[PDB]
Amino acid sequence: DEPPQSPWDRVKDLATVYVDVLKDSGRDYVSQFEGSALGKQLNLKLLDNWDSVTSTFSKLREQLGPVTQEFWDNLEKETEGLRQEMSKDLEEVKAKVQPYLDDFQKKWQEEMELYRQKVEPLRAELQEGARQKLHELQEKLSPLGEEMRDRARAHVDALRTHLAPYSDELRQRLAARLEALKENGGARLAEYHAKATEHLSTLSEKAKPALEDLRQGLLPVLESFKVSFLSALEEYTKKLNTQ
Amino acid sequence: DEPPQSPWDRVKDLATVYVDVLKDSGRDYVSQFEGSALGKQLNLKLLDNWDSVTSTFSKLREQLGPVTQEFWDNLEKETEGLRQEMSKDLEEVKAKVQPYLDDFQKKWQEEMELYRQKVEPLRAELQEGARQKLHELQEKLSPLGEEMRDRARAHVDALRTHLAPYSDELRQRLAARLEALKENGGARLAEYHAKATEHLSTLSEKAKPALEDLRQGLLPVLESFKVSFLSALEEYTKKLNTQ
Ligand SMILES: CCCCCCCC/C=C/CCCCCCCC(=O)O[C@@H](COC(=O)CCCCCCCCCCCCCCC)COP(=O)([O-])OCC[N+](C)(C)C
Ligand SMILES: CCCCCCCC/C=C/CCCCCCCC(=O)O[C@@H](COC(=O)CCCCCCCCCCCCCCC)COP(=O)([O-])OCC[N+](C)(C)C
Ligand SMILES: CCCCCCCC/C=C/CCCCCCCC(=O)O[C@@H](COC(=O)CCCCCCCCCCCCCCC)COP(=O)([O-])OCC[N+](C)(C)C
Ligand SMILES: CCCCCCCC/C=C/CCCCCCCC(=O)O[C@@H](COC(=O)CCCCCCCCCCCCCCC)COP(=O)([O-])OCC[N+](C)(C)C
Ligand SMILES: CCCCCCCC/C=C/CCCCCCCC(=O)O[C@@H](COC(=O)CCCCCCCCCCCCCCC)COP(=O)([O-])OCC[N+](C)(C)C
Ligand SMILES: CCCCCCCC/C=C/CCCCCCCC(=O)O[C@@H](COC(=O)CCCCCCCCCCCCCCC)COP(=O)([O-])OCC[N+](C)(C)C
Ligand SMILES: CCCCCCCC/C=C\CCCCCCCC(=O)O[C@@H](COC(=O)CCCCCCCCCCCCCCC)COP(=O)([O-])OCC[N+](C)(C)C
Ligand SMILES: CCCCCCCC/C=C\CCCCCCCC(=O)O[C@@H](COC(=O)CCCCCCCCCCCCCCC)COP(=O)([O-])OCC[N+](C)(C)C
Ligand SMILES: CCCCCCCC/C=C\CCCCCCCC(=O)O[C@@H](COC(=O)CCCCCCCCCCCCCCC)COP(=O)([O-])OCC[N+](C)(C)C
Ligand SMILES: CCCCCCCC/C=C\CCCCCCCC(=O)O[C@@H](COC(=O)CCCCCCCCCCCCCCC)COP(=O)([O-])OCC[N+](C)(C)C
Ligand SMILES: CCCCCCCC/C=C\CCCCCCCC(=O)O[C@@H](COC(=O)CCCCCCCCCCCCCCC)COP(=O)([O-])OCC[N+](C)(C)C
Ligand SMILES: CCCCCCCC/C=C\CCCCCCCC(=O)O[C@H](COC(=O)CCCCCCCCCCCCCCC)COP(=O)([O-])OCC[N+](C)(C)C
């Protein structure tokens, strides 16, 4: 008759009596736990069992024997399959990896387009509300200020107020530079008057031509500035911004 | 015009001035300067007190030549000082502090009295008016929270339910690990039956009592048994007579 699923027609109406098997054991064992309990006593002992149990414990070792030599041999033909099918699954999963794109783009869209949806109002609902907290900073800092400025001074010494000249004992030294400082200040004193005596004579030579030896060095340096120099001196500048 | 002179060091970008200036006129200025120097007094006095500056840079490095080399000796003693000082500076200090402690009282009462005088009413508006800011937050823990919650599923997974069954191209593993346990668990399940049929029989050798105690419990296990052949097929021979 009929294959696994499609031809289910009358395979099976006489199915539901195969549960009536299991079911109606419990319709009847209810009447039949009554009469075993009625006779319960014995003459047993704790000796006769240990013949049975000693043999029955032997009857683990014997058929463990060959079964132990079985599910070893059996699982290399899984692992030898596995270590060759290793190369097949690495191309099998690739043939699923790239086709999925529509799904992981829809998940990207359900994460990225629905990330900005929350932040786009929240940026403004923080900025427009934080003006009441800009006033919590702007009208806090300067009214601290007015006591904080005296709390920088109030607050620093008596200015070590002396009632007599002899209320420090102190001394001044520093010969470490002060001696070399006097020599660098006394070589300097002779330098700034040697480099004045030749200059004072070079100065006071020229109390007339001084305005016009200067002009003789302007005269032809002028006339070209309005002619040859004009395109050069129309730029003046450039500049900042790398070339 | 534009900004006349140079913001920064600049060998490189000033080429846009240096080319065009030299091309038209930054040539001839040097030869009109040559004729400004060779005309009047004067061509001797650009030299006569130039090498007095050359020999001042020489006389600096050759005076600060034997006062280079021969000089960080006359001064060490001042800081052979300082290491003794900043280890013996004791005797000011444990006499200094004691009397000024008396005005340090009437300055904690400048610094801290005038602080809480502001710092209570500095926050007496916005400790109460924090409950304005909580309507800009507690009513916003829905778009910050209640659907950032639902994003725990939108990450993993925004359920892969299809709008029609015709969707996934799917097929079984099927081979290796599953057949390997179905055969060497299979035949071991059959010997678990044999070791049950053996080991559970060994115990009835030392059963008893009472002679009525056995023949009550037959019928529920024997009637479930009797209907079990209902299977039909409708073939009646099964081909596995393990059926
Ligand atoms: C090799 C191994 C083989 C294993 C299978 C061997 C099985 C051997 C036997 C087995 C049969 C069961 C014997 C139970 C005896 C209990 C005493 C009793 O009064 O029984 C009775 C009442 O019992 C009830 O009132 C309780 C319900 C029945 C017992 C169910 C629990 C059993 C486990 C307990 C857990 C204890 C836990 C604490 C342990 C420290 C049952 O008998 P009765 O029909 O009433 O007749 C008595 C006389 N009368 C009618 C005048 C009253
Ligand atoms: C890589 C190697 C580099 C080496 C570097 C080495 C560096 C070494 C460093 C050396 C500096 C040492 C300190 C000197 C301090 C002098 C103070 C002093 O004597 O004061 C005197 C007055 O004042 C003068 O007589 C002094 C005037 C100083 C002129 C300025 C020199 C500037 C040089 C610029 C160079 C710029 C740097 C150049 C580079 C850009 C005394 O004061 P008084 O007692 O009250 O006077 C009363 C009158 N009475 C004196 C007549 C009685
Ligand atoms: C304004 C900005 C200026 C910047 C440029 C400045 C550049 C300046 C300099 C630049 C370089 C100069 C090099 C000179 C070397 C001389 C070495 C030598 O042998 O000397 C001697 C010590 O020698 C010792 O062993 C001491 C070495 C420690 C020197 C550290 C000094 C730092 C002072 C920092 C202070 C300022 C801190 C800053 C202010 C807070 C030994 O000499 P000698 O063989 O015994 O000689 C013959 C015998 N005789 C001595 C009796 C005659
Ligand atoms: C530059 C960096 C680049 C990185 C790229 C990363 C890529 C990441 C991608 C990874 C791919 C993940 C699977 C996505 C779905 C595959 C396609 C599909 O839907 O297949 C099928 C259903 O789905 C299945 O058959 C999949 C079965 C998954 C089993 C559980 C795997 C556990 C992995 C746990 C450990 C994983 C560790 C991962 C670590 C990252 C449906 O069939 P189809 O094939 O669609 O064919 C349809 C017919 N057609 C072909 C004609 C149209
Ligand atoms: C301190 C307590 C120690 C307990 C240790 C227990 C350890 C042991 C575990 C025991 C578990 C028992 C499992 C039995 C399962 C049925 C097996 C079956 O299919 O056939 C059997 C049914 O016969 C029996 O099972 C006999 C039961 C006798 C009970 C005797 C009373 C003992 C009281 C004890 C009170 C204990 C209370 C405590 C319980 C925790 C065999 O059939 P057959 O009769 O051989 O058939 C004859 C023909 N043939 C030979 C051709 C086949
Ligand atoms: C927790 C740990 C696990 C324990 C698991 C332990 C359980 C393991 C499970 C075991 C269940 C299976 C047992 C074997 C059944 C064999 C089939 C059969 O009996 O055929 C025989 C029927 O002939 C007989 O009646 C002869 C005597 C055997 C009867 C066995 C009935 C068991 C009733 C048990 C009641 C217990 C109530 C308990 C209530 C709670 C032989 O066929 P035949 O020779 O053609 O028949 C001649 C007669 N004719 C001419 C009429 C046909
Ligand atoms: C980097 C920073 C990440 C931040 C993530 C922040 C996540 C958000 C944080 C917190 C959740 C949002 C705030 C909830 C406030 C309570 C609201 C309410 O009362 O309860 C709510 C439930 O609440 C839950 O369902 C809690 C959800 C926790 C999800 C954590 C996901 C972590 C994802 C990342 C993991 C990465 C792991 C990476 C691998 C290591 C609602 O109650 P209900 O009973 O459910 O609703 C019934 C219907 N009713 C509403 C009509 C009544
Ligand atoms: C995108 C899905 C991701 C699922 C991932 C789930 C996670 C597990 C990963 C992977 C197993 C995924 C199997 C289900 C595939 C989807 C359903 C399907 O096609 O089932 C079918 C194919 O059945 C199979 O393809 C069976 C695959 C081999 C056995 C299960 C291996 C479990 C690995 C566990 C590894 C971890 C254990 C680690 C322990 C340390 C069968 O069912 P059906 O379709 O109802 O059949 C109707 C008939 N039809 C097929 C003709 C229509
Ligand atoms: C107290 C609590 C309840 C305990 C209930 C214990 C019940 C114990 C019950 C019975 C004891 C064992 C009986 C074994 C019978 C073997 C013979 C057999 O029928 O073989 C056949 C079927 O083979 C199959 O059906 C294979 C079984 C598949 C695995 C099912 C596991 C269920 C685990 C459930 C785990 C649940 C627990 C989960 C716990 C987390 C194959 O052989 P054949 O091909 O038909 O042979 C004829 C043809 N030939 C000649 C060509 C060969
Ligand atoms: C809350 C749950 C626990 C309830 C506890 C209830 C405890 C009650 C338990 C046990 C009480 C058993 C009382 C009857 C003992 C009679 C002994 C008799 O002589 O037998 C004879 C067999 O013939 C028989 O009829 C064997 C009967 C024992 C079967 C018991 C287990 C089967 C059910 C298992 C159901 C699954 C259990 C699943 C458990 C999860 C002995 O063999 P023989 O061939 O005659 O020997 C040769 C002739 N000669 C003797 C003259 C030399
Ligand atoms: C997947 C769902 C599984 C559900 C569970 C399935 C359970 C499986 C159900 C049943 C298992 C049955 C196995 C017994 C095999 C016996 C073989 C024997 O030779 O036949 C015997 C049959 O009679 C007895 O064995 C039955 C005795 C009935 C009383 C039982 C009391 C309760 C035992 C409860 C035990 C609790 C212990 C618990 C310990 C852990 C003896 O036959 P006989 O009488 O010589 O025949 C000749 C007749 N004449 C003398 C009249 C001429
Ligand atoms: C912003 C930061 C600023 C920090 C401050 C600057 C850094 C300052 C810190 C250190 C620089 C100097 C290091 C000196 C190393 C000495 C080596 C040695 O073993 O000497 C030892 C002593 O010497 C001491 O124990 C060290 C004391 C040095 C003090 C500083 C002098 C700087 C002078 C700058 C002067 C500029 C002058 C003006 C020039 C125009 C042992 O020597 P001796 O045996 O006792 O005597 C040798 C000679 N005799 C044999 C002839 C007696």
Curated annotation (Swiss-Prot), chains A, B:
Task: Reply yes or no: does the keyword Lipid metabolism apply.
Answer: yes
Residues of this chain annotated as glycosylated in UniProt: 239
According to its UniProt record, where is this protein located? Secreted
* Cellular component aspect of the GO annotation: blood microparticle; chylomicron; collagen-containing extracellular matrix; cytoplasmic vesicle; cytosol; early endosome; endocytic vesicle; endocytic vesicle lumen
Q: What is the effect of changing residue 149 to S?
A: In Boston; correlated with decreased levels of HDL cholesterol; correlated with decreased serum cellular cholesterol efflux; correlated with decreased lecithin-cholesterol acyltransferase (LCAT) activity
Q: Which PANTHER family match?
A: APOLIPOPROTEIN (PTHR18976), APOLIPOPROTEIN A-I (PTHR18976:SF11)
Member of which family?
Answer: Belongs to the apolipoprotein A1/A4/E family.
The protein's name is Apolipoprotein A-I
